[PDB]
Amino acid sequence: HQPLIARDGPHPVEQPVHNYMTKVIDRRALNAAFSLATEAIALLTGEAL
Protein backbone atom coordinates (compact mmCIF):
# COMPACT_ATOMS: atom_id res chain seq x y z
CA HIS A 1 0.00 0.00 0.00
CA GLN A 2 1.10 3.59 -0.52
CA PRO A 3 0.94 6.94 1.30
CA LEU A 4 -0.41 10.16 -0.23
CA ILE A 5 0.20 13.88 -0.11
CA ALA A 6 -2.51 16.57 -0.24
CA ARG A 7 -1.57 18.57 -3.37
CA ASP A 8 -3.01 22.05 -3.80
CA GLY A 9 -4.19 23.92 -6.85
CA PRO A 10 -4.03 23.43 -10.61
CA HIS A 11 -3.62 19.67 -10.62
CA PRO A 12 -5.68 16.45 -10.47
CA VAL A 13 -6.63 15.32 -6.99
CA GLU A 14 -4.32 12.57 -5.74
CA GLN A 15 -6.26 9.41 -5.02
CA PRO A 16 -5.18 6.39 -2.97
CA VAL A 17 -3.88 3.40 -4.87
CA HIS A 18 -3.06 -0.14 -3.86
CA ASN A 19 -1.03 -2.65 -5.82
CA TYR A 20 -1.30 -6.44 -5.64
CA MET A 21 1.35 -8.55 -7.34
CA THR A 22 1.84 -12.29 -7.71
CA LYS A 23 5.26 -13.94 -8.03
CA VAL A 24 5.89 -17.64 -8.39
CA ILE A 25 8.37 -19.94 -6.65
CA ASP A 26 11.10 -22.03 -8.31
CA ARG A 27 12.03 -25.72 -8.07
CA ARG A 28 15.59 -26.97 -8.39
CA ALA A 29 17.44 -30.11 -7.36
CA LEU A 30 20.91 -31.18 -6.24
CA ASN A 31 22.72 -34.52 -6.31
CA ALA A 32 25.81 -36.49 -5.27
CA ALA A 33 26.76 -40.16 -5.44
CA PHE A 34 29.24 -42.32 -3.53
CA SER A 35 29.67 -45.51 -5.58
CA LEU A 36 30.79 -48.14 -3.11
CA ALA A 37 33.58 -50.62 -3.84
CA THR A 38 32.39 -54.05 -4.95
CA GLU A 39 34.33 -56.60 -2.92
CA ALA A 40 34.21 -54.36 0.15
CA ILE A 41 30.41 -54.60 0.06
CA ALA A 42 30.77 -58.36 0.39
CA LEU A 43 33.35 -57.79 3.10
CA LEU A 44 30.95 -55.68 5.15
CA THR A 45 27.69 -57.53 4.48
CA GLY A 46 28.90 -60.81 5.90
CA GLU A 47 29.63 -64.10 4.13
CA ALA A 48 33.29 -63.32 3.62
CA LEU A 49 34.75 -64.03 7.05
Partner: protein, 41 residues
Protein backbone atom coordinates in the same frame (compact mmCIF):
# COMPACT_ATOMS: atom_id res chain seq x y z
CA UNK B 1 50.22 -43.73 2.60
CA UNK B 2 51.45 -46.66 0.53
CA UNK B 3 50.91 -49.04 3.44
CA UNK B 4 47.30 -48.10 4.17
CA UNK B 5 47.08 -49.70 7.60
CA UNK B 6 49.93 -47.42 8.65
CA UNK B 7 47.81 -44.39 7.72
CA UNK B 8 45.03 -45.55 10.05
CA UNK B 9 47.04 -43.54 12.52
CA UNK B 10 47.73 -40.25 10.67
CA UNK B 11 50.11 -39.05 13.49
CA UNK B 12 50.40 -35.55 12.06
CA UNK B 13 48.59 -32.55 10.61
CA UNK B 14 46.92 -32.87 7.25
CA UNK B 15 47.10 -29.11 7.15
CA UNK B 16 47.65 -27.35 3.80
CA UNK B 17 44.41 -28.33 1.95
CA UNK B 18 45.56 -27.26 -1.50
CA UNK B 19 44.90 -28.99 -4.85
CA UNK B 20 47.17 -32.03 -4.66
CA UNK B 21 48.84 -33.42 -7.84
CA UNK B 22 48.00 -30.32 -9.82
CA UNK B 23 51.23 -29.29 -8.16
CA UNK B 24 54.65 -30.61 -9.20
CA UNK B 25 53.73 -34.36 -9.02
CA UNK B 26 57.05 -34.76 -7.19
CA UNK B 27 55.72 -37.71 -5.25
CA UNK B 28 57.34 -41.10 -5.67
CA UNK B 29 53.90 -42.65 -5.24
CA UNK B 30 50.46 -41.08 -5.12
CA UNK B 31 47.00 -42.32 -6.03
CA UNK B 32 44.16 -39.99 -7.01
CA UNK B 33 41.28 -42.09 -5.80
CA UNK B 34 37.51 -41.64 -5.87
CA UNK B 35 35.23 -42.93 -3.09
CA UNK B 36 36.56 -46.49 -3.21
CA UNK B 37 38.98 -48.87 -4.94
CA UNK B 38 39.50 -52.60 -4.42
CA UNK B 39 43.23 -52.31 -3.74
CA UNK B 40 42.43 -50.52 -0.46
CA UNK B 41 41.37 -53.79 1.14
Amino acid sequence: GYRYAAAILPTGSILSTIEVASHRRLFDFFAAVRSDENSLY
